[PDB]
């Protein structure tokens, strides 16, 4: 049968391209969790595949003027993809546009920081500005500011849309950078978080988690892969592999 | 008007409570917990009206291997007895099979309740021994996730557990608390379930960590179209911060 066209973003440790000295070629390029699930998954379903990187680079929002999404959410929408199999956050505003399975993975937005210094939580950050702080563009962490009613987020919106070209940055990698290089705090998911705390010991995730989520796998609203996927997830789950997959790559 | 969804539960505080009060109380004003909080919620969001009933056999669902047959809120959706289960539902491989769920409302695992003072620090520590006697809630999550497991550690407590299933599966938590507290017994329990037992009796605690990963969900049968609308409303009430607050509400030391 078909190979299903999956779309994916490079995000270490989910999905990076394999070092190697001779060149690699299709799927035996890639590695990471996100890979290693992807595999489980087509064996379990019985599945082929084709992984192709998202050409925008983006995970996926709205464009508040003219409505149309980009990232793997377009894509998915536009039937360019079967499945996204990326650390891909389950939102109300995605949800309504494309179905995901239920979770692999649980995480929620928290601060990366250096350490050393007395700010302790969002609050922290809300109330200054000589500390600067922000997201990925386009993600899930950057709409949740966008959106929030509540106070203390929305303030910060307010600052992070003021300074966007400064402070939105294009990956994790470039927000890392930032904390690293200059007095900046980078807005993150909490399994990232860990994943280079564990790496860079003068960083630090503060305060705890500002919100709850999952990354599912994406699909095509109606696909009938979506139900198909989730009860992989929960047999993965619970035969111990997700944490097996997990204790692997965050090592 | 439209028809009220009936909607199954069980009692299980904070989730699932009668009222207490000196003038009866009919219908839905009888019950109040998150669950209930929940509920409301869902109702204002998606425009129904409800009636509530507590599953009749009072049990959470698993599956007869003899006959085939479920029981619990599980069959009461299966069966269409239900329109939903708003309760600590837990999202297992097994159920998903049978019914649908919406995506989580909240996140948990297997954990172990047992008194203060012990050298035991794991499932493994108990797997190993049969002076401490243990077990869980009969036809639930828990007891499946046993039954069903193929990891040495845990399908050698299944087999302690099923030779004394008489003994040592119980009807409720509130049984299991009990048990915990009048003999040598562990009690395998979700870990929510947990924090808030051992943040009213400090002569209990958790041991180890979580054993496994899963979600409660609102159940549906299977094909209901509420189960997406119901997966959208969970993630609106967890972003504006709702879910938060009512986990605050009903788990508010040791
Ligand atoms: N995982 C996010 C991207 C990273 C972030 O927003 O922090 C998403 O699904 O959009
Ligand atoms: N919440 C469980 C019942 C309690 C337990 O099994 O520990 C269920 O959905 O079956
Ligand atoms: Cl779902
Ligand atoms: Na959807
Ligand atoms: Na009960
Ligand atoms: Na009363
Ligand atoms: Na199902």
């Known amino acids: 049968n078909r190979s299903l066209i999956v779309?994916?973003?490079?995000?270490?440790?989910?999905?990076?391209?394999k070092k190697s000295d001779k060149p690699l070629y299709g799927n035996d390029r890639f590695e990471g969790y996100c890979i290693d699930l992807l595999r489980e998954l087509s064996t379990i379903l019985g599945f082929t595949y084709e992984?192709?990187?998202?050409?925008?680079?983006?995970?996926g929002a709205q464009d508040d003027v003219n409505g149309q999404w980009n990232g793997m959410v377009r894509e998915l929408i536009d039937h360019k993809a079967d499945l996204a199999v990326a650390p891909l956050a389950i939102t109300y505003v995605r949800e309504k546009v494309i179905d995901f399975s239920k979770p692999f993975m649980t995480l929620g937005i928290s601060i990366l920081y250096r350490k050393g210094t007395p700010i302790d939580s969002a609050d922290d950050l809300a109330k200054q500005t000589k500390i600067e702080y922000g997201a990925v563009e386009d993600g899930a962490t950057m709409t949740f500011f966008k959106k929030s009613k509540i106070s203390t987020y929305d303030k910060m919106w307010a600052f992070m849309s003021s300074r966007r070209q400064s402070v939105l940055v294009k990956s994790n990698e470039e927000g890392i950078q930032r904390?690293?290089?200059?007095?900046?705090?980078?807005?993150?998911?909490?399994?990232?978080?860990?994943?280079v705390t564990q790496r860079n010991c003068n960083l630090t995730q503060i305060g705890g988690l500002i919100d709850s989520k999952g990354y599912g796998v994406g699909t095509?609203?109606?696909?009938?892969?979506?139900?198909?996927?989730?009860?992989?997830?929960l047999q993965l789950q619970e035969e111990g592999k997700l944490h097996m997959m997990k204790e692997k790559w965050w090592r």
């Open 179 to 195: 904390v690293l290089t200059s007095d900046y705090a980078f807005l993150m998911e909490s399994t990232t978080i860990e994943f």
């Open 51 to 59: 992984i192709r990187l998202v050409e925008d680079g983006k995970y």
């Open 7 to 17: 779309t994916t973003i490079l995000e270490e440790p989910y999905v990076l391209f």
């Open 220 to 233: 095509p609203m109606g696909s009938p892969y979506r139900d198909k996927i989730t009860i992989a997830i």
